């Protein structure tokens, strides 16, 4: 009745057997015209699909959605080549390694590179940074903005920030993230979560509390995938090691997993995790005051 379906026409389907919303969509057009006209059947089948959302779209319609997929440059051409252009949208990219490696440098570099117009007509956009480590430093972005020759205050105005103190708070923040993306449609292009799981290890530090930890972690990660795909944003998350933490839950949620390690002297190496030992699955990059860049 909200859409405009008649009061006397909704009670017609109750007599034959239709009593639930799932029974309306599952009843075929061939069997719906035996209670009826196909003009009223197309109005009952359309309104049911609005409320129930089966999620079925053709591969052509999915291809039109994937044509909007972009990549956000890491600041290093070699690293970008490895990723197929950079941090991909409609996907979660996870980067893990030691503390001395450039997980925080990559997080801060992306805060600036995501605002810059790039390859494939990428126009740049705003960023949402969720900080669980108390590591976000806006002063760090000023040095990176200097490297890209962009205004400091403008870079800082396009980054939204929030500290998460608990796993529950981290999940509540994702509700505000979705609402913010829904407000300024197509404005935001990157969601950074540094780090994705430290709060989950903290809140569920017992062997008996691991079942609820896994459930809450999987609920957040499935929501994160939905946000990345529904709003066409790149999701970049950092992770700790013990092998990366999170087991199969984080491995499944992430579409691209990058292992960061120290190389010769001040150089760093990025590799696709669990991939075979071959040169095409590895890339060399440098860390400077201007963020992630290429080797000298």
């Amino acid at each position: 009745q909200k859409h405009g379906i008649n009061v006397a026409d909704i009670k017609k389907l109750k007599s034959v057997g239709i009593c639930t919303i799932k029974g309306i969509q599952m009843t075929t057009r061939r069997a719906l015209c035996n209670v009826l006209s196909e003009a009223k059947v197309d109005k009952i089948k359309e309104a049911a699909n609005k409320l129930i959302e089966p999620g079925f779209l053709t591969a052509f319609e999915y291809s039109e959605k994937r044509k909007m997929v972009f990549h956000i440059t890491t600041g290093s051409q070699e690293f970008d080549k490895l990723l197929g252009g950079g941090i991909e949208s409609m996907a979660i990219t996870e980067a893990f390694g030691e503390f001395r490696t450039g997980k925080t440098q990559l997080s801060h570099t992306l805060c600036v590179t995501a605002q810059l117009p790039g390859a494939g007509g990428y126009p740049g956009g705003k960023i949402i940074f969720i900080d669980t480590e108390n590591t976000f430093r806006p002063d760090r972005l000023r040095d990176i903005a200097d490297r890209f020759n962009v205004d400091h205050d403008a870079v800082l105005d396009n980054v939204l920030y929030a500290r998460a103190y608990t796993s529950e708070h981290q999940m509540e923040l994702l509700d505000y993230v979705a609402a913010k993306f829904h407000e300024e449609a197509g404005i935001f292009k990157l969601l950074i979560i540094d780090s994705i799981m430290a709060l989950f290890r903290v809140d569920f530090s017992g062997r008996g509390e691991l079942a609820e930890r896994q459930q809450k972690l999987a609920q957040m990660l499935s929501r994160l995938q939905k946000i990345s795909e529904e709003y066409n944003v790149a999701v970049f998350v950092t992770n700790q090691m013990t092998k990366p933490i999170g087991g199969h839950i984080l491995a499944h949620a992430s579409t691209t997993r990058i292992s960061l390690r120290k190389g010769r002297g001040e150089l760093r190496i990025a590799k696709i995790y669990d991939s075979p030992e071959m040169p095409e699955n590895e890339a060399t990059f440098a860390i400077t005051a201007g963020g992630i860049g290429d080797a000298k």
Partner: peptide, 5 residues
């Protein structure tokens, strides 16, 4: 609105 710098 987004002001690209």
């Amino acid at each position: 609105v987004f002001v690209p710098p």
